[PDB]
Short mmCIF file of N, CA and C in Angstrom, two decimals:
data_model
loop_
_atom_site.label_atom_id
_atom_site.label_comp_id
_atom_site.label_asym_id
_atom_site.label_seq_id
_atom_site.Cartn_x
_atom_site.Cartn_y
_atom_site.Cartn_z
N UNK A 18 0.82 -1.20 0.00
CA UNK A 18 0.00 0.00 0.00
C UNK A 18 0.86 1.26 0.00
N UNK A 19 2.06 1.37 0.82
CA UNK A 19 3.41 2.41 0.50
C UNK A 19 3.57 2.41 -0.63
N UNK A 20 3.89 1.65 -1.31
CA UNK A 20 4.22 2.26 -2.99
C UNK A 20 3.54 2.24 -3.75
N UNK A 21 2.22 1.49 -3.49
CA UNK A 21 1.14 1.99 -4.22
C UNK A 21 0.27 3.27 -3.80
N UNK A 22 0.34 3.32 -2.68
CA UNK A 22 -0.24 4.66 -2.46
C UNK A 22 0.81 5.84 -3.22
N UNK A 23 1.68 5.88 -3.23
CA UNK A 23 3.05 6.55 -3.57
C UNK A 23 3.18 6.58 -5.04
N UNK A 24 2.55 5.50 -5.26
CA UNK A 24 2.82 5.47 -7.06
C UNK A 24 1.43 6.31 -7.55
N UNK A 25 0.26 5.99 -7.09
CA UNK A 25 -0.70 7.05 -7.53
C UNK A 25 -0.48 8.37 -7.72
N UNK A 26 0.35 8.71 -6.65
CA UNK A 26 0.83 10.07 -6.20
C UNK A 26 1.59 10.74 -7.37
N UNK A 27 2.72 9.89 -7.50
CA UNK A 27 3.59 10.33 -8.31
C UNK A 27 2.34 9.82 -10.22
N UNK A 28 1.62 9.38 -10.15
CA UNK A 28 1.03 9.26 -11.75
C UNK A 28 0.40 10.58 -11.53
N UNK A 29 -0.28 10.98 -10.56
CA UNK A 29 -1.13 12.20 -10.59
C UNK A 29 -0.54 13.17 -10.60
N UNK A 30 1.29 13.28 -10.35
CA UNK A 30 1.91 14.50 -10.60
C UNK A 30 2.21 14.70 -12.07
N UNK A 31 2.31 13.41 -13.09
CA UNK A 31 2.65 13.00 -14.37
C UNK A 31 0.83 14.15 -14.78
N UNK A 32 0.10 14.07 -14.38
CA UNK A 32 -0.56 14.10 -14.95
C UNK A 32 -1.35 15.94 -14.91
N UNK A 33 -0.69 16.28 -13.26
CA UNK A 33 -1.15 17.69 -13.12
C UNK A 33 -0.04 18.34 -14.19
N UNK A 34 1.31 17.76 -13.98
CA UNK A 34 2.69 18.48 -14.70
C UNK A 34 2.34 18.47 -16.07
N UNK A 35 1.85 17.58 -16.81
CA UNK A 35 1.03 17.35 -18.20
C UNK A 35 -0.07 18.18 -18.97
N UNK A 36 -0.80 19.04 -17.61
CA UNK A 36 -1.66 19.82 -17.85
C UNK A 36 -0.98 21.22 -18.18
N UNK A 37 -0.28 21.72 -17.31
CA UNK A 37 0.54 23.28 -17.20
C UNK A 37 1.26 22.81 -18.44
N UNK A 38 2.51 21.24 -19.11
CA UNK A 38 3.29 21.48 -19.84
C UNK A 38 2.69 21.57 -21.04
N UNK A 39 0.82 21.28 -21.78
CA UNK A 39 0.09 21.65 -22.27
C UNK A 39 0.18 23.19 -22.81
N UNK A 40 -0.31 23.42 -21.52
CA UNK A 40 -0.65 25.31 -21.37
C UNK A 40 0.84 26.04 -21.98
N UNK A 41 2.03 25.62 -21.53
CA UNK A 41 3.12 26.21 -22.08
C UNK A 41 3.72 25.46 -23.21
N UNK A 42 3.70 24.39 -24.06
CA UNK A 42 3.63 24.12 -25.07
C UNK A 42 2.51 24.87 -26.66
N UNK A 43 1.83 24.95 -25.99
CA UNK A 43 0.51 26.07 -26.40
C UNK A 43 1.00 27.11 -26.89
N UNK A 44 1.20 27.93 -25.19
CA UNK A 44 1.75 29.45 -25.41
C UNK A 44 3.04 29.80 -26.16
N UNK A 45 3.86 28.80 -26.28
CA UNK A 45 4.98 28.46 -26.67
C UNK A 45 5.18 28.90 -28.81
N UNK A 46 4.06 27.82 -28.90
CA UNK A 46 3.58 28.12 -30.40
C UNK A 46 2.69 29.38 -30.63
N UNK A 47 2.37 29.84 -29.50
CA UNK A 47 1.35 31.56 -30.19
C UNK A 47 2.35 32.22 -29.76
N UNK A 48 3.59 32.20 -28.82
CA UNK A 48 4.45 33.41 -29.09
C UNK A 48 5.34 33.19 -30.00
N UNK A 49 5.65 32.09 -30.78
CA UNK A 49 6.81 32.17 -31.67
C UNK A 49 5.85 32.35 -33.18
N UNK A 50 4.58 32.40 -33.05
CA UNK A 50 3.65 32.99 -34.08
C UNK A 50 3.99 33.96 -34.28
N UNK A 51 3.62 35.08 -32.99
CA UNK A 51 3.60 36.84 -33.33
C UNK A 51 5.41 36.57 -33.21
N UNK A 52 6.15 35.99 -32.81
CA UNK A 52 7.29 36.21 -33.52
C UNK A 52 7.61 36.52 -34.78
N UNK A 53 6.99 35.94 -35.59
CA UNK A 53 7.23 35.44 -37.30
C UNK A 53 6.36 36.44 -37.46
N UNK A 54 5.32 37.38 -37.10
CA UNK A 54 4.79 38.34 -37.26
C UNK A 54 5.24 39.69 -37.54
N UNK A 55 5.67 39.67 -35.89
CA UNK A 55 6.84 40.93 -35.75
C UNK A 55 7.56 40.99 -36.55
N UNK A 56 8.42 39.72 -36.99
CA UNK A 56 9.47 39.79 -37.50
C UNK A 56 9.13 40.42 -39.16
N UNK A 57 7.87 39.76 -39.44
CA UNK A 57 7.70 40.52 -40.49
C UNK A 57 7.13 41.88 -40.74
N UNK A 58 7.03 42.18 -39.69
CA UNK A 58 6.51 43.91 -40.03
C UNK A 58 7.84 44.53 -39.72
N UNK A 59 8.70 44.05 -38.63
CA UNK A 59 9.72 44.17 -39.01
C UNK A 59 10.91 44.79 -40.59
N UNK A 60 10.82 43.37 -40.80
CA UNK A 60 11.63 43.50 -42.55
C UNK A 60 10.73 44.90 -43.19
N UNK A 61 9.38 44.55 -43.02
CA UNK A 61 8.58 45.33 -43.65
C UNK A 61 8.63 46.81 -43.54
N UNK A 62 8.70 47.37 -42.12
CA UNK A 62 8.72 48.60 -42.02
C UNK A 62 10.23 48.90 -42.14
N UNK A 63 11.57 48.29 -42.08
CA UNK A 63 12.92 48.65 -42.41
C UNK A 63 12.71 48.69 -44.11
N UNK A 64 11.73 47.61 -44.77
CA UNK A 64 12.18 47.98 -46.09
C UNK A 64 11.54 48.82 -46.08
N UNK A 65 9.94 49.35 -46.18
CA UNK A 65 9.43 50.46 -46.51
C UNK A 65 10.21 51.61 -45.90
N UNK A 66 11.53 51.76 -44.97
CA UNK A 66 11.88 52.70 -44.71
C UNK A 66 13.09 53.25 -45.35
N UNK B 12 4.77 51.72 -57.27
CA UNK B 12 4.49 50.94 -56.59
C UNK B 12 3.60 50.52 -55.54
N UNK B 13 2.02 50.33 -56.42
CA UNK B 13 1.09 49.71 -56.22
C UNK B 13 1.68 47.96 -56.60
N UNK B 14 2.29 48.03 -57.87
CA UNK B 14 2.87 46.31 -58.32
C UNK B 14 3.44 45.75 -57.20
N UNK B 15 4.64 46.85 -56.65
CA UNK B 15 5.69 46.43 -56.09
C UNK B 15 4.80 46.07 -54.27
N UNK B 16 4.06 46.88 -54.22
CA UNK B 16 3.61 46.21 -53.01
C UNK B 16 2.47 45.51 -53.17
N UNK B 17 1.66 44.98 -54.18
CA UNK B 17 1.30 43.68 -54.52
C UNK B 17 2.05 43.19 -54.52
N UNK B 18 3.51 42.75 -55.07
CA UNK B 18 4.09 41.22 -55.68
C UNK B 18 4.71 41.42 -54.39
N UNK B 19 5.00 42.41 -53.28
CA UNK B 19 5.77 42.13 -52.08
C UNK B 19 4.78 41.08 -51.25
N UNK B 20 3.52 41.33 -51.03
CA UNK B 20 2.25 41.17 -50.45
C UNK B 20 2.71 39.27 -50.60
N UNK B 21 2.55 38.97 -52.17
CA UNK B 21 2.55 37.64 -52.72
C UNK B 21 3.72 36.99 -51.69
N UNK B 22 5.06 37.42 -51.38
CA UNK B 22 6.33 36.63 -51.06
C UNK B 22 5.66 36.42 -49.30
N UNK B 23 4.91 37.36 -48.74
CA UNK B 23 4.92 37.04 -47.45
C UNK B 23 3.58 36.17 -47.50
N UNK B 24 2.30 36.13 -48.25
CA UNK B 24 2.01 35.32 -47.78
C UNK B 24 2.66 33.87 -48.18
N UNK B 25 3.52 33.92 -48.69
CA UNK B 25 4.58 32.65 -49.00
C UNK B 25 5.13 32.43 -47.80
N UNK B 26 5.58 33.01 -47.19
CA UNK B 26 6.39 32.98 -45.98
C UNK B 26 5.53 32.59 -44.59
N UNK B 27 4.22 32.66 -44.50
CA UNK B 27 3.01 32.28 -44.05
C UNK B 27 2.59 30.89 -44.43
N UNK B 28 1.92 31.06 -45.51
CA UNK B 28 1.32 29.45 -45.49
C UNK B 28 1.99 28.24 -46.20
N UNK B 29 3.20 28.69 -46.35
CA UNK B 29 4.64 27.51 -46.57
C UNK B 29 4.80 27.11 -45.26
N UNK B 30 5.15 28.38 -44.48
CA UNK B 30 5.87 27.71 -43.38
C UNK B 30 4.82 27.47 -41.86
N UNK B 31 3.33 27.78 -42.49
CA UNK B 31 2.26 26.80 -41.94
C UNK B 31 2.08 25.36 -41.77
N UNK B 32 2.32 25.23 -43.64
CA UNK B 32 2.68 23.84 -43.77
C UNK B 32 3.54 23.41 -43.24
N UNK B 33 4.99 23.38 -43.09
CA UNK B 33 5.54 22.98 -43.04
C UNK B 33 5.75 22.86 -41.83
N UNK B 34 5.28 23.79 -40.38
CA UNK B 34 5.21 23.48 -38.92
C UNK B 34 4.40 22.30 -39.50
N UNK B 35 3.43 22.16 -39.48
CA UNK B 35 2.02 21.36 -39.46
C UNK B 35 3.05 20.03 -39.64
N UNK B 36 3.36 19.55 -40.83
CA UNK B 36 4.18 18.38 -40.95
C UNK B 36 5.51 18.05 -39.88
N UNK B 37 5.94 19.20 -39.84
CA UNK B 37 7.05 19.00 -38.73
C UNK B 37 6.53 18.75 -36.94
N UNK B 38 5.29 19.45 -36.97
CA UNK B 38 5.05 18.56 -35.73
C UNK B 38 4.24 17.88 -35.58
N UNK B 39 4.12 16.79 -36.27
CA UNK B 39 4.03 15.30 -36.84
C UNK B 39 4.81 14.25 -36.73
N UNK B 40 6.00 15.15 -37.19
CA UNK B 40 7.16 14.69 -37.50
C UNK B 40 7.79 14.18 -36.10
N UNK B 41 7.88 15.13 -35.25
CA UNK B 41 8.10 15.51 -33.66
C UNK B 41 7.50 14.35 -32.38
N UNK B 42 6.02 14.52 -33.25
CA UNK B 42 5.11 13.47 -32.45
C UNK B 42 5.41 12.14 -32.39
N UNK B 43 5.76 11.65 -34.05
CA UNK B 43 6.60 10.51 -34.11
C UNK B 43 8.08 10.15 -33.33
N UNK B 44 8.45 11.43 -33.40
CA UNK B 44 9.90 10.78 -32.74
C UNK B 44 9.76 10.44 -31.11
N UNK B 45 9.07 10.84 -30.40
CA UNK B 45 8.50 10.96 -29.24
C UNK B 45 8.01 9.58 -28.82
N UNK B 46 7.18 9.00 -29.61
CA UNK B 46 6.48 8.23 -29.54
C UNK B 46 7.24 6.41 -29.64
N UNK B 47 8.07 7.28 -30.51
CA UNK B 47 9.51 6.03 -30.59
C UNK B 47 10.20 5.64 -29.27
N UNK B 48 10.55 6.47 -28.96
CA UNK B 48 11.19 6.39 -27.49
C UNK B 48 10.75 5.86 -26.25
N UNK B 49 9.09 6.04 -25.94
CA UNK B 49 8.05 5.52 -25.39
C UNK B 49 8.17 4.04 -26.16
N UNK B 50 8.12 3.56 -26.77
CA UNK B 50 8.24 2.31 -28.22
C UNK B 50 8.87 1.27 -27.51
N UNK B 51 10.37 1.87 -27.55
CA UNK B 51 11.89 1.23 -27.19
C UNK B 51 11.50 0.80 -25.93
N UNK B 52 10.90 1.54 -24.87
CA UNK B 52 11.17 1.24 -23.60
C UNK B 52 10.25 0.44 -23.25
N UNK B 53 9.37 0.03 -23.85
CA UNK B 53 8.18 -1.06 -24.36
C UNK B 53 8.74 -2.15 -24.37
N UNK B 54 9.92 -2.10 -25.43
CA UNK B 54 9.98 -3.71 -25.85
C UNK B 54 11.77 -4.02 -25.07
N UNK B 55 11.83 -2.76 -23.89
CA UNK B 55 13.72 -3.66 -23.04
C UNK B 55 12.60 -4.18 -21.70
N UNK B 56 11.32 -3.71 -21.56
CA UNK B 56 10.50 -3.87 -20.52
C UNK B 56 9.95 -5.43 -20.68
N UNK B 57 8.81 -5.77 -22.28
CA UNK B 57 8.46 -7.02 -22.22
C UNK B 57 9.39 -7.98 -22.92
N UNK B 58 10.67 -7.53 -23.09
CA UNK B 58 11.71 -8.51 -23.61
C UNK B 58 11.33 -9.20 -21.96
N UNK B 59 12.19 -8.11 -21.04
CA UNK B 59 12.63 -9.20 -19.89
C UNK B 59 11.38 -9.73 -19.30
N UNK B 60 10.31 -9.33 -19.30
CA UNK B 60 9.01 -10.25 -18.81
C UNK B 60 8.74 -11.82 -19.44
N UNK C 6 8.01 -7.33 -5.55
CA UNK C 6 9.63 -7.08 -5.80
C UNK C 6 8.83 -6.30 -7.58
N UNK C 7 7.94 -6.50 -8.11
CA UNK C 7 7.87 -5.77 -9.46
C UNK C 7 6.87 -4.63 -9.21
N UNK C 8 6.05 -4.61 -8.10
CA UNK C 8 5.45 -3.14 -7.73
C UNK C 8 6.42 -2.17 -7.45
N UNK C 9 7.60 -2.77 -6.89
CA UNK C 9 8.61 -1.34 -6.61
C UNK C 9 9.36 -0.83 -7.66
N UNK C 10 9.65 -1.42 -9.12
CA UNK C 10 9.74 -0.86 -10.37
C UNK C 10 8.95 -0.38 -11.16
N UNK C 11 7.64 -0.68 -10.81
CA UNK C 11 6.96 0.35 -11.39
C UNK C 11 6.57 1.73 -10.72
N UNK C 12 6.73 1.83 -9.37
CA UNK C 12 6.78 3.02 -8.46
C UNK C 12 7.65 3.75 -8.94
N UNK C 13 9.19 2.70 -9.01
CA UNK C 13 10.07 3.77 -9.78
C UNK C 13 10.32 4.57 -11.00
N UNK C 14 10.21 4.13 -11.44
CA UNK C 14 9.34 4.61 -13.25
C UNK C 14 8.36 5.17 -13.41
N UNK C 15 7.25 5.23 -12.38
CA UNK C 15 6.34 6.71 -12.49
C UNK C 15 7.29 7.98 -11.89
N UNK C 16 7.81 7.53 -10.91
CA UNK C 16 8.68 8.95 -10.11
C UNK C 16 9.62 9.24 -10.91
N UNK C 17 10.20 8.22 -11.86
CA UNK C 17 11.40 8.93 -12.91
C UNK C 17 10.36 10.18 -13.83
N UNK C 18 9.16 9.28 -14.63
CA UNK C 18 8.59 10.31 -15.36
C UNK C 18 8.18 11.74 -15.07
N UNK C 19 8.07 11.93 -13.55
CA UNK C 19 8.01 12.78 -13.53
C UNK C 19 9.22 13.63 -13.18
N UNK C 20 10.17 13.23 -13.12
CA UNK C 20 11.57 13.74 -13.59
C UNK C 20 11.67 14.53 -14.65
N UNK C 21 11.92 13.43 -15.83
CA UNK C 21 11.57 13.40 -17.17
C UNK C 21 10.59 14.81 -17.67
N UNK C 22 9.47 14.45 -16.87
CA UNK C 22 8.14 15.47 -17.43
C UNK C 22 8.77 17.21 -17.21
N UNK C 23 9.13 16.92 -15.69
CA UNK C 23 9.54 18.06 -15.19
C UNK C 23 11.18 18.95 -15.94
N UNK C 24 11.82 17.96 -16.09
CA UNK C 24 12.91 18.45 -17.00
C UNK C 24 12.11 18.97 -18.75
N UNK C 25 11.91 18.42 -18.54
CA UNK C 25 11.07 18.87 -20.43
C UNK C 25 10.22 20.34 -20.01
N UNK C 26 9.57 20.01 -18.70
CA UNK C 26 8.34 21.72 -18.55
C UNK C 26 9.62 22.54 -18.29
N UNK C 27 10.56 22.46 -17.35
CA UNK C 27 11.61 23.57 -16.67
C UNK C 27 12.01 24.00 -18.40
N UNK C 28 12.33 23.29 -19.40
CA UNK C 28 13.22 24.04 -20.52
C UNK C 28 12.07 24.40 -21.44
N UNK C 29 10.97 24.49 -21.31
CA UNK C 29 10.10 25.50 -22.06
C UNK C 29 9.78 26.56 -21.24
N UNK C 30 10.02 26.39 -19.75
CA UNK C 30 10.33 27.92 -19.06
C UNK C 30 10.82 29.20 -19.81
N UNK C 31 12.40 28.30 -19.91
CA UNK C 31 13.62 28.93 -19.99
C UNK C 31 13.70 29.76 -21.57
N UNK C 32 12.84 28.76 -22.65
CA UNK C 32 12.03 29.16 -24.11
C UNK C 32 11.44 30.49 -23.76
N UNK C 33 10.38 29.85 -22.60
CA UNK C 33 9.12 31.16 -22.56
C UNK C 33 10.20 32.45 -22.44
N UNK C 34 10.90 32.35 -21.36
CA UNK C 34 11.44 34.13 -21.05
C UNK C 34 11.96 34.28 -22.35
N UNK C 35 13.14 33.58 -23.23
CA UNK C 35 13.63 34.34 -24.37
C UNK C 35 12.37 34.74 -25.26
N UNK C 36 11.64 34.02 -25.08
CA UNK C 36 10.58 34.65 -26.21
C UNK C 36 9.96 35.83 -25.53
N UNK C 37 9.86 36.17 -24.53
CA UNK C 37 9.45 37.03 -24.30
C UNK C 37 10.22 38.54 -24.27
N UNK C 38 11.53 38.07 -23.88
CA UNK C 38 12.34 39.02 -23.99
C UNK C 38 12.43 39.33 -25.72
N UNK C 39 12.70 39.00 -26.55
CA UNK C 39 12.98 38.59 -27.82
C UNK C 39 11.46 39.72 -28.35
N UNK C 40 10.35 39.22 -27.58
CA UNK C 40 8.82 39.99 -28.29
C UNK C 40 9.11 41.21 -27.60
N UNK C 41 10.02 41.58 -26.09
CA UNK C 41 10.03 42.88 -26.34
C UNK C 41 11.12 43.38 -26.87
N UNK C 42 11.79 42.88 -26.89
CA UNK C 42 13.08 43.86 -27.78
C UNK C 42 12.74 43.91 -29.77
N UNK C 43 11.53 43.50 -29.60
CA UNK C 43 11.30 43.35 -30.97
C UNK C 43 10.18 44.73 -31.30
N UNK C 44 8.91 44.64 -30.21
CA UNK C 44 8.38 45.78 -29.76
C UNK C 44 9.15 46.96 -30.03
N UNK C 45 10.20 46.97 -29.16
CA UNK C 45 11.25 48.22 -29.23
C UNK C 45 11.58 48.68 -30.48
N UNK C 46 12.11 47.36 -30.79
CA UNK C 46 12.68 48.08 -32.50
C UNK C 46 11.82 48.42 -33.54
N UNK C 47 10.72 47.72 -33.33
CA UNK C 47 9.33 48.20 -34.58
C UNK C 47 8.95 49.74 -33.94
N UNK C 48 8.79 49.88 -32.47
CA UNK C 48 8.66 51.25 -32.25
C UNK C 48 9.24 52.42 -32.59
N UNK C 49 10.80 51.94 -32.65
CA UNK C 49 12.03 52.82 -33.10
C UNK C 49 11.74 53.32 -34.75
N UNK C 50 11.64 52.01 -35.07
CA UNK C 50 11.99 52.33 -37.01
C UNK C 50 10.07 52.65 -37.02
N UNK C 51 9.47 52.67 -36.32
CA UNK C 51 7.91 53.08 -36.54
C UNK C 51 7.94 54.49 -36.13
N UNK C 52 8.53 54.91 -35.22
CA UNK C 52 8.87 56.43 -34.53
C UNK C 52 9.72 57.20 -35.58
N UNK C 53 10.90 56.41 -36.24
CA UNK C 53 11.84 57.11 -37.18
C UNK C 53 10.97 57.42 -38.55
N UNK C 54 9.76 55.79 -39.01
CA UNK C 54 9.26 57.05 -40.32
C UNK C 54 9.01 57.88 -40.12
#
């Protein structure tokens, strides 16, 4: 029951840590979006300048 | 340059939905390799069983 | 004697899990730093037209 109680424990941390690494895998891809964004208004407003 | 910022217009959305595609396939690509590794540790686990 | 290897192998994963979330941390700040120093410079060459 020690390491099974213990092993639940540790699956349910697999699984809260899984949720947040979700959320920042996510955010991860919408900021390197407006990256490629920026970057192009970027080029854009140096060339138009 | 009305042309010139039409045919500029044309290269970025190139630079957009090329490299849409080409995330899209690449993390596919990603998913697979991931999934390999999980794979391996499958079969050093029911080898020794 | 095989419940205590699998105890151990959930507590590795979340090793594992946790090393993989800590280095999309370390992603998140450059990207963030990166979106503002990018801010900056579109403001600059947006202030200079």
């Amino acid at each position: 029951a020690k390491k099974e109680e213990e092993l639940q424990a540790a699956l349910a941390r697999v699984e809260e840590e899984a949720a947040q690494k979700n959320m920042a895998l996510k955010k991860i891809r919408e900021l390197e979006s407006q990256i490629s964004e920026l970057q192009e208004d970027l080029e854009s407003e140096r060339a138009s300048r | 340059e009305e042309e010139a910022k039409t045919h500029e217009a044309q290269i970025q959305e190139m630079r957009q939905k090329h490299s849409q595609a080409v995330e899209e396939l690449a993390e596919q690509l990603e998913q697979t390799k991931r999934v390999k590794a999980n794979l391996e540790k499958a079969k050093q686990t029911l080898e020794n069983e």
